[PDB]
Structure 1
């Protein structure tokens, strides 16, 4: 657990984390109020499985609800009303035991933080920010889902719940809460939600003031077509958009360029995500995932959100590639503990660890076979990865003595050098 910043000063924490997304969308529904006890009970497992960090759900209490026609939601944390740590996932006391047990087993706790907005109209809540005082986005003219004088980022839905995160007083509030999470809830890092809602520069602000040396990740989900026509990003690549954000916030960023290639291109096009980047400075800030709570399915209620879910026929291949490649991989809870991909994912974590693959290890792609075939230069071992390809032996693409590390789904997943 080497914990340092990247050459460009990005908060990647050594570049050797292996993160577990600690929850799915329907937990509040499936294990109402018992979520932190379940995690306290699994901390030992999570640690033994190889994770270095865990991404916790929003700690700020959410008692929102929404219906209209069979299909509901609420209380997951993205529409919180207070910094109180009560209900939905568990009590403040179970949170403390959860974090104390996780941290005690060597797993960092990363908190999901939601600064863009809050449940403004919730009755019984501890934070009350009046209108006309400049605390809210809507205190200014709001022409459209574009920055106004009261919010230097996009808005959430209508934008009636958007805070002016730039207001000294709204800024200091979040800053205090972050420090709080760190001194009393053992936070080891933060996962910023909806990063397009407020300046990236503010995220660096928050990290410098509260946990300068911790791990951070931002989720920027905004494609080129969502930027104005005159903006340079309207014609850039997904990777450029994502890297610019990282350059300014000084935090790694979820690799939405690889997610977009997993969803829209071929396995061969997977080399086009941030983590395939021939530049170490580019590749090393990527946070690769296969699915999260938004993009994927969740057990229970209506399959969850599944906004951009990867087909089950590519799950094994997706994990085999983020677990063996550069960037910092995230494993989805359900894949891991619900759906039975666990043993396969345990094998890969071991292989990543044994070859000493890290954020910045080099990777080269091999042109002449079908599927994706890559040579990943681990700091201890070289890996040869052949996904859905015709590659016959590792020696056809790399010099050296090789051993079968993984061999799954009728040869569709093959990884060599132990």
Structure 2
């Protein structure tokens, strides 16, 4: 399985609707071997990109397009055999009306009835000025720009699960990506995952890595990946829940610039989440926050193919970013890499065997079928066993396949 993020921070501005534009990309997306497409938040939102949702049921108000266009897009993907996952933004919500205090805290679901029609009682206790102090305290981090939803309130859970089931049954989404998952407890996420029964689910849990006095990440990042593993275990290690592997992304960001030794932990295992629980980690090079037009934690631009050579051949579930595939002229190289992974049966739990990890060389063998090399090291032929032919090579990367 390989994920594809089908939008960037600028998609909402697209002339003629993003859903419409994406229709012309489905043949290419399906042909590359992509199994799941992550679509942007679909509902009405004060912020154009959709991360400040108001009327959860109002899909027609989205900058990406309307409900009809969304359904056709998902229909085309399903026909092609690819699943669609929705970006679920439920830590916070924006209110439709002002209450007596003149505070925007009266919500509206987007239907003529009372579905999702909450008030300041559903807002987390201490989230000032929005809250009326009657709700329960936040189960996780607060999101500063908007009212945090009190997920301990039973009507909240009930009506949200009902919306999730609607997204699935009516719209046709197959799974979820939980935005700002650190905003509520694993217990809370468990309720939604269990009651909506998605086929796939991935949470966004982003916390700082551990740093040294030099201003760069520490060699060991166990505290960081432990936090991701702890969440998965709480929601259900046997279910469909996974987490984005921010540990690997943070390490690869700097390893790629002449410090490839960072890619081998003391135990000879991968340093990120994939080194402990690959089945539950989804790897990536950049997303709409880290890269795109936000630049929160960009991968060195000239070395992105090294990032793709790593995640596309390694354990865990890789996620390809829109821009890199279509806008950067990397499509052919990326295509080839997914093909190598697909033909050899490499999956989220493939065995990783790190052969070398020098400053200028990272050499690893996976499932005894594929060997990947990152780095400028010119000749490494002496290190690659017999019965291995070059399958792909590019700027500071090469991959060999057996037979």
Same-fold status (TM-score > 0.5): yes
Q: Does 1:406 align with 2:389?
A: no
Deviation at 1:129, TM superposition (A): 1.9
Equivalent residues of 1:32, 1:89 under 8 A apart: no
Within the alignment, does 1:112 sit opposite 2:96 as a pair? no
Deviation of 1:275 (Å): 5.0
Q: Which residues of 2 match residues 13-412 of structure 1 at below 5 A?
A: 17-29=1-13, 31-32=14-15, 34-62=17-45, 64=46, 74-83=47-56, 84-86=58-60, 87-120=62-95, 125=108, 126=110, 127-131=116-120, 133=121, 135-138=122-125, 149-157=136-144, 160-212=146-198, 214-223=199-208, 237-250=223-236, 251-265=241-255, 266-271=259-264, 272-277=270-275, 279=276, 282-297=277-292, 304-367=293-356, 369=358, 370-377=360-367, 382-390=369-377, 392-393=379-380, 396=383, 399-409=385-395, 412=396
Distance 1:140 1:329, change over 3 A: closer
Q: Deviations over 1:23-62 (max 9, x none)?
A: 0011112x15511111223222210111011001111122
SS at match of 1:237: helix
After TM superposition, the score normalised by the length of structure 2 is 0.83
Q: How many pairs align?
A: 359
Q: Measured at CA, do residues 44 and 368 of structure 1 come closer, stay the same or move farther in structure 2, by a change above 3 Å? A: closer
* 2:148 alignment partner, SS class: coil
Alpha-carbon separation, structure 2, partners of 1:141 and 1:88: 29
Residue 149 of structure 1 deviates from its aligned partner by 3.6
Name the CA shift for 1:376/1:201 in 2 (closer, same or farther; >3 Å).
same
SS at match of 1:321: helix
Give me the whole-angstrom Cα distance separating, in 1, the residues matched to 2:209 and 2:333: 35
1:184-217 deviation line (CA, Å, top 9, x unaligned)? 11111110000100011222221111125x1010
2:24 aligns to what SS in structure 1?
helix
- Is the CA contact (8 Å cut-off) linking 1:256 and 1:273 kept in structure 2? no
CA displacement at 1:417 relative to structure 2: 1.1
Match of 1:415 in 2: 399
Q: Is the 8 A contact 1:239 1:257 kept in 2?
A: yes
Provide the C-alpha distance between the structure 2 equivalents of 1:269 and 1:54, rounded to a whole number of angstroms: 31
Tell me the residue number matched to 1:69.
none
CA RMSD of aligned residues (A): 2.4
TM-score by length of 1: 0.80
Structure 1 equivalent of residue 216 of structure 2? none
Find the aligned partners of 2:243 and 2:97 in 1 and give their Cα distance: 31
Tell me, yes or no, if the aligned pair for 1:296 and 1:305 is still in contact at 8 Å. yes
Considering Cα pairs closer than 8 Å and 6+ residues apart, tell me whether 1 or 2 has the greater RCO: 1
CA positional deviation for 1:403: 0.5
Cα 1:291–1:156 shift into 2, 3 Å: same
Offset at 1:141?
8.2
CA deviation vs aligned residue, 1:389-414 (integer Å, no higher than 9, x gap): 537445625x54110011112xx111
Does the Cα contact within 8 Å between 1:394 and 1:402 map onto a contact in 2?
Answer: no
Output the CA distance in 1 between the equivalents of 2:22 and 2:271: 32
Unmatched 5+ stretches in structure 1: 1-16, 65-73, 143-147, 227-234, 298-303
Q: Structure 1 189/368 Cα, relative in aligned 2: closer, same or farther at 3 Å?
A: closer
When residues 417 and 395 of structure 1 are mapped into structure 2, their CA distance, relative to the original with a 3 A threshold, is farther
Q: Which runs of 5+ in 2 are unaligned?
A: 99-106, 111-115, 130-134, 212-220, 265-269
Tell me the CA shift for residue 339 of structure 1.
1.2
Q: Within 2, Cα distance between the matches of 1:305 and 1:314? A: 19
